[PDB]
Structure 1
C-alpha cells in the first residue's frame, strides 16, 4: 500500500513536540517521517525495498477543521484539515518524479533529479560535453508518480445565508489518486500551498497568488 496512516491524536499524546511542529512546517516533517517510516519498514521486511522504496505518512484526525471560506494567507505553508464536495477530478496523469534527461548533442543521460512540486527541474550543463544546449526527457529511464487534480467546494448545507460556495484545487500524488470521485463528500488534509508558478506576473492585474492544496490524507464520508 506504500502509505502508513498516523493518528494525529496518538502522535500528540505520545510526542507533543512533533505534533506541535507538524502543522507549522509540514513539508520537512513529512519528509522526515517518510524517511523514518521507510527505515522501520525495511527493518521489519528487508525484502520490501524492491516494492516501493518510499513510504508516505498520512496524518489523520487533525484537531482544527477549516472550511474553504476561512482559508487566508495566515494558513499558507501549513497542514490544514477541511471538508468539501469533489466537483471535478482529472484523470490520473503521469508526473515526473525522478527525471533522466537525454542530452541531444552527445546522447549522454543526465541522471535523476527530484522533480519537486514547486518549479520545473531545468538541468544545467551536460556533464560530458558541458553543453547547456537543448535537453529532452528520457521517458524510458524516468520514473513517474501518478498525479491527479481535484476541485472541492464548500458543501451546500454548510454554505449559509446568501454566500456563494468557495472552491479550491487539490493535488493527489501516487496514492491518493482515484480515492475520490466527482460528487463525493470528503475531508481533505494537506498543505496550503502557495508557491509553484502562479503569481499573475503577466501584468493582467493585481499580484495575487493562485493557491492549491497538496493533499496529504483523504477521508470519504460514507
Structure 2
C-alpha cells in the first residue's frame, strides 16, 4: 500500500515509499500518449535539449489522469516530491541524451496550472508549506544577485577546506570546529569550490480591478531561483506557483509585540498572462483597395473623423527611418498633436491606440526621465526608468500636454530632434537612447477653439515645439442637426 498511517511529509521520506515513488514517476515519464499516440515527454524533452534549458514542464491534469496517488501526495508535502521528480527526470534525459552531463547536470520539473487558482489576500496559516497558485501584478525586482548553494569554507590555521554544507533560505549556514586542528574560529568562504546560483526577489500584489473591490490591495514576496530569474518586469501580470514558506523575523516581533513570522512564496513556475500565415495577407494586400478597408478598423466606436483616422493610421505603422549618407540623422518617427474643444473623444483616441499598438506606454501631463529612487526591496538608491525610455522603440502617449512644467518642456524638445537623453544626475553620468513616436492632445484656450486666430494661438504652446510635430489635426465642433441623431443613436 502507498498510503499508511503516518504524516504525508514523513511517509514520503521513508526509504520504501521514496523508492516506490521514484520508480512510479519514471513509468509515467516514459509512457504517456496524448490523444494521438505521441509520447509527449519524448518530443518535449527533445525540444528542451535542443536549447540547453534544464527545466521540464509537467501539466498537472495529465499527472492526475495517468497517476491517481502522486497527484494527491503532491500539494501536501511538495518540498520532497519535487526533489524526487528531479532525480527521475534526470535519469530519463541522461538516457535519451547520454552526453547531456556536459550541460548543467541538474533538472528541475515545473508544474503547470494546479486546479486551485486563488486570491492573494485569502492566504491564511492553513497553507504553510503547500503548493499554491495565485495571480497578480509584479511591482518590483532586484538585480540578479548570486547566492551560495553548496558552500565550502577553509580553516585559517591548517589550510584545509571544511565540509560542503548546503544553504537553506532561512538561516546562515554554520560550520563547526575544524576536524583537523580543532581551530574553532571565523572561517571564510572558498570562492573556487563553492557553487552559486542565481537569485532574484520580487514583490507581487493584487491585480488593480480584479479583487480590490472596496479595500486596499495586499502584496506578497516571491523568490525566483536559478532558471527563473528575469521572467517578469515591473508592470507584468503573472501567475505564480510556489511553496508558501514562512520564516522567523525578529523585527516584526518588536513592532507587533507578538511572535509573528514573515512569509514568502518560493516560486516554482511563472507563466505570464499578457499580449505576445502570410498566404492570406498576400491577396489581402493585393486588394489594391486596402486603404478604405483599414481606415475604418481603427477608431472602432467613435463615429466620424475619417479625416484624423487617416493621419493616425499613417502614424501607427510609421514610415521609414532612413539614414542620410551626409551625417544628418533624419528621423523616422511620426509625431501627432491633436487639439479641439472639450468633449470630442480625444482621450479615447489615445486609449484605443494604447491597446492596438504594441510595447506602448502612457502618461498624463498634469517621471518623463530616469530619476533616482530608493528601491522598495533592496533599500539602495538606484536609478529608475522614466516615461520616454519605456517607449524606446514603440509609442509614447502624452495626455494633458498643456499642463507640462518648464523642466518638462525643456526636456521634451531635446528628444524630438536628437532622440537621445543624457543623465548627469546624483546617480551617475550616462547617455541613453530614446526612439519613440509622440502622440499627444492639447486643449483650446478659453474653453473653445476659435478659428479667427492662427492655431499657434489657441494651442498655448511654445512655438519651436509645434515644429517638432509632423501632423497638426484640429478637432472642432458645430451644432449640426443631421449629426445629432447620428451621434446620439450611437
Q: Deviations over 1:120-164 (max 9, x none)?
A: 211112221122211111112211000000000000111333211
Q: Secondary structure at the match of 1:68?
A: coil
Assess, with a 3 A threshold, how the Cα gap between structure 1 residues 79 and 132 changes in structure 2: closer, same or farther: same
Q: Which residue, 84, 87, 95 being the options, matches 1:35?
A: 87
Would you say the 8 A contact 1:199–1:210 is kept in 2? no
Tell whether 2:127 aligns with 1:99.
no
Would you say the 8 A contact 1:149–1:172 is kept in 2? yes
Q: Secondary structure at the match of 1:214?
A: strand
**C-alpha distance in structure 2 between counterparts of 1:15 and 1:36, whole Å:** 15
More strand by share: 1
Would you say the 8 A contact 1:24–1:79 is kept in 2? yes
**C-alpha distance in structure 1 between counterparts of 2:255 and 2:214, whole Å:** 33
TM-superposed deviation, 1:66: 1.3
**C-alpha distance in structure 2 between counterparts of 1:4 and 1:178, whole Å:** 18
**C-alpha distance in structure 2 between counterparts of 1:68 and 1:209, whole Å:** 18
TM-superposed deviation, 1:199: 7.7
More helix by share: 2
**C-alpha distance in structure 2 between counterparts of 1:29 and 1:53, whole Å:** 19
Assess, with a 3 A threshold, how the Cα gap between structure 1 residues 204 and 135 changes in structure 2: closer, same or farther: farther
Q: Secondary structure at the match of 1:220?
A: coil
Q: Deviations over 1:147-187 (max 9, x none)?
A: 00000000011133321111000000001100111110001
Would you say the 8 A contact 1:85–1:155 is kept in 2? yes
**C-alpha distance in structure 2 between counterparts of 1:122 and 1:160, whole Å:** 43
Tell whether 2:249 aligns with 1:200.
no
**C-alpha distance in structure 2 between counterparts of 1:76 and 1:102, whole Å:** 37
Q: Secondary structure at the match of 1:31?
A: helix
Assess, with a 3 A threshold, how the Cα gap between structure 1 residues 204 and 82 changes in structure 2: closer, same or farther: closer
Q: Deviations over 1:27-85 (max 9, x none)?
A: 01111111111111112222112211211110111000111101000011000000010
Gaps of 5+ in 2: 1-52, 274-490
Bigger relative contact order, structure 1 or 2, given CA contacts below 8 A and separation 6+? 1
Would you say the 8 A contact 2:249–2:260 is kept in 1? no
Counterpart position of 2:212: 160
Would you say the 8 A contact 1:198–1:210 is kept in 2? no
Question: RMSD of aligned C-alpha atoms?
Answer: 1.6
**C-alpha distance in structure 2 between counterparts of 1:125 and 1:181, whole Å:** 44
**C-alpha distance in structure 1 between counterparts of 2:259 and 2:248, whole Å:** 15
**What is the count of residue pairs matched by the alignment?**
221
Counterpart position of 2:73: 21
Assess, with a 3 A threshold, how the Cα gap between structure 1 residues 56 and 199 changes in structure 2: closer, same or farther: farther
**C-alpha distance in structure 2 between counterparts of 1:2 and 1:188, whole Å:** 19
Would you say the 8 A contact 1:179–1:218 is kept in 2? yes
Would you say the 8 A contact 1:101–1:111 is kept in 2? yes
Assess, with a 3 A threshold, how the Cα gap between structure 1 residues 160 and 167 changes in structure 2: closer, same or farther: closer
Counterpart position of 1:132: 184
**C-alpha distance in structure 2 between counterparts of 1:198 and 1:213, whole Å:** 19
**C-alpha distance in structure 2 between counterparts of 1:202 and 1:46, whole Å:** 55
**C-alpha distance in structure 2 between counterparts of 1:38 and 1:91, whole Å:** 30
Assess, with a 3 A threshold, how the Cα gap between structure 1 residues 84 and 203 changes in structure 2: closer, same or farther: closer
**C-alpha distance in structure 1 between counterparts of 2:162 and 2:248, whole Å:** 24
Q: Secondary structure at the match of 2:133?
A: strand
Tell whether 2:77 aligns with 1:56.
no
Would you say the 8 A contact 1:106–1:129 is kept in 2? yes
TM-score, with length taken from structure 2: 0.44
TM-score, with length taken from structure 1: 0.94
TM-superposed deviation, 1:118: 2.8
Would you say the 8 A contact 1:30–1:57 is kept in 2? yes
Assess, with a 3 A threshold, how the Cα gap between structure 1 residues 166 and 99 changes in structure 2: closer, same or farther: same
